[PDB]
Symmetry: D2
Subunit: 261 residues, 4 copies
Amino acid sequence: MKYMITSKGDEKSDLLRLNMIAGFGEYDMEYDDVEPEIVISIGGDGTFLSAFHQYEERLDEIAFIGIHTGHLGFYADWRPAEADKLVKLLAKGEYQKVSYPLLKTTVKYGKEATYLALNESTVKSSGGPFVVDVVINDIHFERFRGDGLCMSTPSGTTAYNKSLGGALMHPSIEAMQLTEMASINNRVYRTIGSPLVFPKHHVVSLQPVNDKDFQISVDHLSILHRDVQEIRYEVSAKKIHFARFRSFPFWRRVHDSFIED
Amino acid sequence: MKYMITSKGDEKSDLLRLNMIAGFGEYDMEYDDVEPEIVISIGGDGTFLSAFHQYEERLDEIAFIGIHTGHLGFYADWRPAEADKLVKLLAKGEYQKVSYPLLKTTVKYGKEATYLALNESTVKSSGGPFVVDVVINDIHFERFRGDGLCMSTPSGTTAYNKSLGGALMHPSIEAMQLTEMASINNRVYRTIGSPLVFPKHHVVSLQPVNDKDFQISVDHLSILHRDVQEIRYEVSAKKIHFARFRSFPFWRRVHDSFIED
Amino acid sequence: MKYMITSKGDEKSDLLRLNMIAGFGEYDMEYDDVEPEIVISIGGDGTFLSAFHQYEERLDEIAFIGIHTGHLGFYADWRPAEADKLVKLLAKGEYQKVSYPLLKTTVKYGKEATYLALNESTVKSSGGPFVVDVVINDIHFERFRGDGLCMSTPSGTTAYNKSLGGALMHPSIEAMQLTEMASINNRVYRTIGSPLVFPKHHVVSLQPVNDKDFQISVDHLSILHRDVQEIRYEVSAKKIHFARFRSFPFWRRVHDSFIED
Amino acid sequence: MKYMITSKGDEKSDLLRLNMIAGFGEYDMEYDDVEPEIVISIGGDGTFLSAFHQYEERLDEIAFIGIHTGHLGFYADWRPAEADKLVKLLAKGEYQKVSYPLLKTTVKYGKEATYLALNESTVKSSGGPFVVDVVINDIHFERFRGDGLCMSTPSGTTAYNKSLGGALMHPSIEAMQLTEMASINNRVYRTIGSPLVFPKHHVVSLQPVNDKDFQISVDHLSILHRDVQEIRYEVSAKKIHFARFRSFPFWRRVHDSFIED
Ligand SMILES: NCCS(=O)(=O)NC[C@H]1O[C@@H](n2c(C#CCN(CC(=O)O)C[C@H]3O[C@@H](n4cnc5c(N)ncnc54)[C@H](O)[C@@H]3O)nc3c(N)ncnc32)[C@H](O)[C@@H]1O
Ligand SMILES: NCCS(=O)(=O)NC[C@H]1O[C@@H](n2c(C#CCN(CC(=O)O)C[C@H]3O[C@@H](n4cnc5c(N)ncnc54)[C@H](O)[C@@H]3O)nc3c(N)ncnc32)[C@H](O)[C@@H]1O
Ligand SMILES: NCCS(=O)(=O)NC[C@H]1O[C@@H](n2c(C#CCN(CC(=O)O)C[C@H]3O[C@@H](n4cnc5c(N)ncnc54)[C@H](O)[C@@H]3O)nc3c(N)ncnc32)[C@H](O)[C@@H]1O
Ligand SMILES: NCCS(=O)(=O)NC[C@H]1O[C@@H](n2c(C#CCN(CC(=O)O)C[C@H]3O[C@@H](n4cnc5c(N)ncnc54)[C@H](O)[C@@H]3O)nc3c(N)ncnc32)[C@H](O)[C@@H]1O
């Protein structure tokens, strides 16, 4: 059907994309980058994250596929040498789709704005101290003082979440995980410390204590928000679909990336 | 219906149990400690854990209730002052049941033995170094060298799991969490480090490398097993049922126990 | 002799400073805020840190004293109720001085600038990814990829250092401690992970890999440096002197601040 | 002068020891394993630790040297291929000695026993819960509830200490470091959490709360002590001397063992 290919932009990835396009020309594959049904990413996980955000309005119509040209990327699970076998099996089709949960972020002002994250969403202060009240399902849970907070999807737990001490969780669990960045704990200030794993339909809300300006990141994009009233996290109802052509299990994907490959 | 009451055994808890028994005598409540339908625990979480293991063969017929006489216990969510209101609402009935997942542990020899855990199951060495191969769904994931490993239920994540760096997870998620105890990491030895959260139907298997003797604990009971061939973890198909008489949410239960009450 | 008093600036601290000034008027105490020999800080640890940096050019001539008006500050070890006994014993003199080590930070451009820190000095990126090569006594030790790094004095180990997982070290040890902020570790990227404690005369140098712009903080002051060639840490030859009027041991100071008071 | 050689006991190490003995026969080297002045260890760090404890009564008369036959050992800083150059330079002499601090452990009963540790000394319970009061220079600092505690030398910080989250500290600092094993922290129970680094002449004392039986380990040897009244840690006045034939800096030794070699 309709497909498109995004490239990291270096000489290695553009030439691989050109070779795949020429290979696709020999089938009933039609290149369309406004309404594709298959989105191929060639580069690293940063390239894949950009592909997902380019098309985050047609997630229900698209199956994604990653090729990693350098360091093995966690979402880009194909080697450049296998690209021809990729074109072929893709051209035939009859693959199986797999879906991972996503994170919804809502930011309220004094007006609303919503974002979808594939890895995580984080909050830090705009300069001064970061102080926020953490409300879970409308009950005040804790006052956080520290560098910031990170809310991760399941497939995001191997990224930023992991460097902060968070747990790795299999993407079949529809959840989100909140981790702390350098919280202060003394006789006067108390946070839970542990990461927290939330089920679907739970809403975590962050609320300002003094400053109302924060640096909010969604995946790779970091933007300073002013006059913020509340930041709202929940597991999205939307899911990203991958096209799988063979079994490549998550825990093997984890083994290959951290234990050795 | 049929009920029974286990006591911590100190003068405070026995007298509370006697007062509740006398209070129950004024209704169609019948004391039966061989086939109860309601099991009341009076003491702390250790007393509750013993109550659960006393009746782990009739978990589908029993709803549990805890009263904490001293330090607020995580499973014993009633104060001694409220015991009369407890007897009354219990006597009437019409409460709502809540269910938490459990962990299944299977130990194979050279012969099998299975256990149910409400908090966690752990493995350490019988003296010498602890070295085990970790197999996830029949794929070799890592060789662990360290003090031991801990596999936790959701409601167990606030116990031993928490002291080891694990995440806290809401009990509506049917999962189990594996945490490390003091793993060695150098150029030669590599573990994942992070906690791992497994969904239902995933099987984690631990396999001996040199020594075949291990100290295996299920909740409070610690037993040395000899001639062990394999230790197998999975989320149980069995669930523990609690009788709830009002909303006491897990995250509030967590707030009260660690942030302050 | 000559003394001065800095105040947090709220109504509570200014009136305490005015009362102490009037109390000092009854002795051979002379107020001088250009060349004092005693510097009193009234507020919190932020107020004390500012007092130290106001006079960091006459550290050898000055003994510092802190009074904490609110939350017990780690450097401000006097209560407002004891201020009159403070004026008196200070007026008499014959106290004992105690000295804590300090951290020297040198920043080279393409030109040099040096700073003294009482708590710590940190480095983060100016926006993009933070990547730095860590050179210890002119040997390349590691390439750090992460959020940033923190180098702490001994008396700084209970501050930012502590929230990052660092050890607490007694101020009689002339050392500095380097801690990581959220380092990435996979098959491709490797840091030591552990905090590192360096003796006097060891030089840790940080060197840019791609970007040359960094956010460098010394205690409370955070400044973006451009065109940076190298950042150099070592234990200073300079020491801060405190005036002590009674035994208040560091580990008790630690107990009171984190265990309870 | 007088030398001796201990071997790991496998075919590789015994033959290396025999070749070195024959090489030593060509000089004024005399084999003596009751009163040596040079002690060579051939194997791994376990072999080196045993060599040190065999001769811990003549530490002032002995310089130690390690050869590692397998995995690079932290104390055994020679390769088997360099053994002939080792015999030669050793035979000539004129090397430089380096000294590392050691840990003293005193155990009191109801009677005393003292031990020297090169890596660390640890304490765990004999079965039940481990609860101990931690007294620092005769002030009660904290009540520890957990799996146990570990007190490390500087050169021990890369061993067990490191796996528990402790800092790595250069051996020129005469200190000891206390780390926690899985401490419980809630509203009722509080430990410091952080590692603690103590200077010379500070005394840390551990005191029983309920049980008086503990498992105490000194380096590799683990022994159950009964009727224990107190366990006392301090930096020893004794030091171990190494014979160095070239510069092999500690931080390079750390880089080679954990970053890569
Ligand atoms: N500032 C980037 C510096 S970088 O070293 O971390 N690069 C990423 C590495 O991370 C792997 N990875 C990813 C990813 C990604 C893309 N990333 C950068 C880009 O969009 O161009 C954005 C993501 O960074 C993560 N992150 C940010 N700051 C830290 C930190 N301090 N520590 C650890 N990660 C951090 C964050 O998650 C952003 O979303 N997604 C992965 C996944 N789901 N699982 C495993 N690896 C994954 C990628 O292959 C490359 O090696
Ligand atoms: N050796 C016990 C020493 S004790 O200090 O930890 N006591 C328990 C504390 O723990 C709270 N708790 C529990 C529980 C329980 C009962 N427990 C002991 C008994 O059966 O008699 C057995 C459980 O211990 C846990 N554990 C063991 N070693 C450690 C450690 N090193 N660190 C932290 N815990 C540890 C392990 O989980 C066993 O199952 N279950 C809880 C829950 N689900 N959530 C929150 N708190 C809970 C209890 O209220 C009391 O305060
Ligand atoms: N952004 C400040 C937010 S604040 O919550 O942390 N405030 C400080 C708390 O810290 C105690 N403290 C200090 C101190 C100090 C002054 N401080 C702020 C000011 O100069 O106005 C600057 C210092 O902050 C430290 N820091 C920064 N970011 C974090 C973080 N993420 N986590 C933990 N600390 C952090 C950093 O060290 C700066 O130097 N010095 C202490 C000491 N030596 N020992 C014990 N407590 C001490 C003070 O009493 C107050 O409670
Ligand atoms: N039960 C041993 C299992 S073992 O995997 O850890 N082996 C040691 C590894 O450790 C390196 N090492 C050493 C050492 C040593 C000798 N050791 C064993 C023996 O005496 O036969 C005894 C030492 O173990 C340490 N330790 C114990 N339990 C743990 C744990 N859970 N995690 C991490 N270490 C642990 C403890 O320190 C004992 O003293 N001394 C080193 C040093 N100073 N610096 C760097 N590496 C060093 C050796 O090369 C080998 O690789």
